Write a protein that binds this ligand. Structure first.
Ligand SMILES: Nc1ncnc2c1ncn2[C@@H]1O[C@H](COP(=O)(O)OP(=O)(O)CP(=O)(O)O)[C@@H](O)[C@H]1O
Ligand SMILES: [Ca+2]
Ligand SMILES: [Ca+2]
Ligand SMILES: [Ca+2]
Ligand SMILES: [K+]
Length: 968
């Protein structure tokens, strides 16, 4: 169906629905059975990055050398392409495997928190899943809700209705809707002002309509078909900078070896020698270039996102992970975010006697802490019947009629309809029973709305003035049923607008001494151990005429609140979440300065920061907290200075929340806002990272880079930890390959400078890449979090990636790894059991091999080109670089406190590589391409003896790191 133009009567008759009741269970069934619910090569390809493009060229030019039918050896040339291609597809499959597991955790998280919608059906308004909405349902949504499906407006409960069409049309400015018909069918969607389209957000107003499209038939579903954190741009620069350094050395090695082209090992020709050293340069390039750098990125990000899904935290922005790591300060909302978001009225007071500055007191306490309509009114450990007091009856009238706020039969609990703060005013009226009406004969769903239904019948609701966050009050005007204005709002804001007080039923003007009697108790409830929210309850006994008043401007409603009469004030208890006290404590240990940006009273906010940990109980607050009205009354010199020191902000308007973030960003402070309502939407947008609770508004979820299905605030601390756990893993990844592959460069330069036969065959240089730089390097993405991961200071994006001291340890480790594999091959010539005994100053020039060269006779003939030194160099090179992989588990922590088995993915990786190293040397057909199996008894005891002290070379510098930890 495409019924859009015609009036509301014909579209309701098309579906055969009633606006009051709605569809039934069997009518939704058929409609659900007719339209339905309401809702590989590129995957494998990780090869798009620049570094992968190099080995693909190196694998092709190596494939061309094998096409010449010689390759210096018919079987050896065939191995060079496979060694290069195996490491590329291996790192690709592992990275896709983690993206495979990452997509499996996101889909399971979608089932954990399905989108919700507010509907009217035959079985009060109820909320169900968004996919169960069928065409014909009656849907009523308010400010902050996301439009679930295409809806034809049938009624508007406000003076205006604004809808944000930024997702569908691209218009950032909201447009005003209406229930009037439109003339033309095929007009553009921007001219359709009587339709609510899915995906759009409600900017202002509260409307109710009928659904005309679901699932695929949705208007936004028609078009829906068809870089990360400059660190990666820096990594793309790092990959480009490191490649040019390697490219400069490889072309230099080919020039250094220009004099060795004519050696007899190559065949006695410059062409025969240039090709062999051209393969040396290519084998050195492929070995030195990091292969799994694009793979460790996907590995760490797919590991982190899958760890966040385990803790039930949605990540809507992929790059927003490591931005959390560099977060300097975090500022979060209080209500719903730092509290358990459970409102219930526990205390209440009115005025008893007033004379001059002397005023008396009375305190009414409410038992029970739930949303259930059961409780007892008590005063001084004694029950109180609230029928005698006319002030409590008028107080109950304010709590009931100025509010628009259902028993769950499945779980057997009462759930709130609307906001939680207003819901506590509803259950408060039910507990009073001011008119002494019998409540036992009614059912549970009838008991929860029993006392409010009686007041609704006694006093008719004429019209309502919407709540605004700037004037901090909600005004309603009532009239007895057969043909009074009373307002509730902020205590410090309404009492100033109250010029009268009603002692019992007698109204007398406001006394400045009695005004302070009320505020002192409000502060004691706010700053006490209870930390209660207070709501001033007033009534305007000189109500203005209806049409004499204007409802177009919400800011003009302050004139309508002049000459109020104070009735009373109620207290509400919303305990903080049991994990928030530890969250700020770990944020203090991580250098993150926690800020509380809320709109409630400062007396309530400063008492929280003392309980939670933002402020110490022994700490005093001199200039570390300000109200919104005090924040604007500070000189510009102290205006910015307060943003750096103050860890709490109260009574701020939604326009001031976005500014506080802007003042922090001016000092280059990385911020993170956590909010639940549309109040925080300008702040969530403006901030670097936005956080919205799972029970928060959908507008806050859209602007937030994270959504917490489990609204526990402890996830924020673990979220910053994971962004800091991907950073150090990328450090250990670069820490491993650089410090190891520099020794590969030191190896080749040392053999030429010392005067020994060159270290390894180009195939022997490509093999160590497949073993040392492959799956052992990718397994570093699975490293466990470091011991000091949440105590070390945060990251500054202005500073370079590699520190000055870290560049030193890259060389210090590279000097030993390079000299160990050369000294191993040197050991075979100097003193070897199975080898010759030829020292005589290492016979620095080995080029003299025949015949019985004078003054170097030699015990035997020329034994160069023998595999025993070459394999000795590779046996240690593979072994010493596996011992270096154990050093990359932590940054500065000793290995006796970070055991090697903390990373299970690496231990099994080294055993697979060492077995692959052993499978290669010991299986008879393989040592033709490779050269010769070494000795088992004596050599491996020497390989282990040489490859072991590299662990000592690393832990002694961690001792220096444990002595003092500075970048340098
Ligand atoms: N619906 C309502 N009617 C009357 N007064 C309200 C009200 N909602 C809040 N107030 C009061 O107005 C003052 C302003 O509160 P505001 O709504 O601007 O921030 P908040 O802290 O309540 C939202 P958050 O959950 O994000 O912390 C509060 O002190 C509150 O007591
Ligand atoms: Ca490599
Ligand atoms: Ca909130
Ligand atoms: Ca290597
Ligand atoms: K943002």
């Amino acid at each position: 169906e495409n019924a859009h133009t015609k009036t509301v009567e014909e579209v309701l008759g098309h579906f055969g629905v009633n606006e009051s009741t709605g569809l039934s269970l069997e009518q939704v069934k058929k409609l659900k059975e007719r339209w339905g619910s309401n809702e590989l090569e590129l995957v494998i390809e990780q090869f798009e990055d620049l570094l992968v493009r190099i080995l693909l060229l190196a694998a092709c030019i190596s494939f061309v050398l094998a096409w010449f039918e010689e390759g210096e050896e018919t079987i050896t040339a065939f191995v060079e392409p496979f060694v290069i291609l195996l490491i590329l597809v291996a790192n690709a499959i592992v990275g896709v495997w983690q993206e495979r597991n990452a997509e499996n955790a996101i889909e399971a998280l979608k089932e954990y928190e399905p989108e919700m919608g507010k509907v009217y059906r035959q079985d009060s308004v109820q909320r169900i899943k968004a996919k169960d909405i069928v065409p014909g349902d009656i849907v009523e949504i308010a400010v902050g809700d996301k439009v679930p499906a295409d809806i034809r407006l049938t009624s508007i409960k406000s003076t205006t209705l604004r809808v944000d069409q930024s997702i569908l049309t691209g218009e950032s400015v909201s447009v005003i809707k209406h229930t009037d018909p439109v003339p033309d069918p095929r007009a553009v969607n921007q001219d359709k002002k009587n339709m609510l389209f899915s995906g759009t957000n409600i900017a202002a107003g509260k409307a109710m309509g009928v659904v005309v499209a679901t699932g695929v038939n949705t208007e936004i579903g028609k078009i829906r078909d068809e870089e990360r954190t400059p660190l990666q741009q820096k990594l793309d620069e790092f990959g480009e900078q490191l490649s040019k350094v390697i490219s400069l050395i490889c072309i230099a090695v080919w020039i250094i070896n220009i004099g060795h082209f004519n050696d007899p090992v190559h065949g006695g020709s410059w062409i025969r020698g240039a090709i062999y050293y051209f393969k040396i340069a290519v084998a050195l390039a492929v070995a030195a270039i990091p292969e799994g750098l694009p793979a460790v990125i996907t590995t760490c990000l797919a590991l982190g996102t899958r760890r966040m899904a385990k803790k039930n935290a949605i990540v809507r922005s992929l790059p927003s992970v490591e931005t959390l790591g560099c977060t300097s300060v975090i500022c979060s909302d209080k209500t719903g975010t730092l509290t358990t978001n459970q409102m219930s009225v526990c205390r209440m007071f009115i005025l008893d006697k007033v004379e001059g500055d002397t005023c008396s007191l009375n305190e009414f306490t409410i038992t029970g802490s739930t949303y259930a309509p059961i409780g007892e009114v008590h005063k001084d450990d004694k029950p109180v019947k609230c029928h005698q007091y006319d002030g409590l009856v008028e107080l109950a009238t304010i709590c009931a009629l100025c509010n628009d706020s259902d028993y769950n039969e499945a779980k057997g609990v009462y759930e709130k309809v609307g906001e939680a703060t207003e819901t506590a005013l509803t259950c408060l009226v039910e507990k009073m029973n001011v008119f002494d009406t019998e409540l036992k004969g009614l059912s549970k769903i009838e008991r929860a709305n029993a006392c409010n239904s009686v007041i609704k019948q006694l006093m008719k609701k004429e019209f309502t003035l919407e709540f605004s966050r700037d004037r901090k009050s909600m005004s309603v005007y009532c009239t007895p049923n057969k043909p009074k204005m009373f307002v509730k709002g902020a205590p410090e804001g309404v009492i100033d607008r109250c010029t009268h007080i009603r002692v019992g039923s007698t109204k007398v003007p406001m006394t400045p001494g009695v005004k302070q009697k009320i505020m002192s108790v409000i502060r004691e409830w706010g700053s006490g151990s209870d930390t209660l929210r207070c709501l001033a309850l007033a009534t305007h006994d000189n109500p203005m005429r209806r049409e004499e008043m204007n409802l177009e401007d919400s800011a003009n409603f302050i004139k309508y609140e002049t000459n109020l009469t104070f009735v009373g004030c109620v207290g509400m208890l919303d305990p903080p979440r049991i994990e928030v006290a530890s969250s700020v404590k770990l944020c203090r240990q991580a250098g993150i300065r926690v800020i509380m940006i809320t709109g409630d009273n400062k007396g309530t906010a400063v008492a929280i920061c003392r309980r939670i940990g933002i402020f110490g109980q022994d700490e005093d607050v001199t200039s570390k907290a300000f109200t919104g009205r005090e924040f604007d009354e500070l000189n510009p010199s102290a205006q910015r200075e307060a943003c750096l020191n103050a860890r709490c902000f109260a009574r701020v308007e939604p326009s001031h929340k976005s500014k506080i973030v802007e003042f922090l960003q001016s000092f280059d402070e990385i911020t993170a806002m956590t909010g639940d309502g549309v109040n925080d939407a300008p702040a969530l947008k403006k901030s670097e990272i936005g956080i919205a609770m799972g029970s928060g508004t959908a507008v806050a979820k859209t602007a937030s880079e994270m959504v917490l299905a489990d609204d526990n605030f402890s996830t924020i601390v673990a979220a910053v930890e994971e962004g800091r756990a991907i950073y150090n893993n990328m450090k250990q990844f670069i820490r491993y390959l650089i410090s190891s592959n520099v020794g590969e460069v030191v190896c080749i330069f040392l053999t030429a400078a010392l005067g020994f036969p060159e270290a390894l065959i180009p195939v022997q240089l490509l093999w160590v890449n497949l073993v040392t730089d492959g799956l052992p390097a990718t397994a570093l993405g699975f490293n466990p979090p470091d011991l000091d991961i949440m105590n070390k200071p945060p990251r500054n994006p202005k500073e370079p990636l590699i520190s000055g001291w870290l560049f030193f340890r890259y060389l210090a480790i590279g000097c030993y790894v390079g000299a160990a594999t050369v000294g191993a091959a040197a050991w075979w010539f100097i003193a070897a059991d199975g080898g010759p005994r030829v020292t005589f100053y290492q016979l620095s020039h080995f080029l003299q091999c025949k015949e019985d060269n004078p003054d170097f006779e030699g015990v035997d003939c020329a034994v160069f080109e023998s595999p025993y030194p070459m394999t000795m160099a590779l046996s240690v090179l593979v072994t010493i670089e596996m011992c270096n992989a154990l050093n990359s588990l932590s940054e500065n922590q000793s290995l006796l406190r970070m055991p090697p088995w903390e990373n299970i993915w690496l231990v099994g990786s080294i055993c697979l590589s060492m077995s692959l190293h052993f499978l290669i040397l010991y299986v008879e057909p393989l040592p033709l391409i490779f050269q010769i199996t070494p000795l088992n008894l004596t050599q491996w005891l020497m390989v282990l003896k040489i490859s072991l002290p590299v662990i000592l070379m690393d832990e002694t510098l961690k001792f220096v790191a444990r002595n003092y930890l500075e970048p340098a």
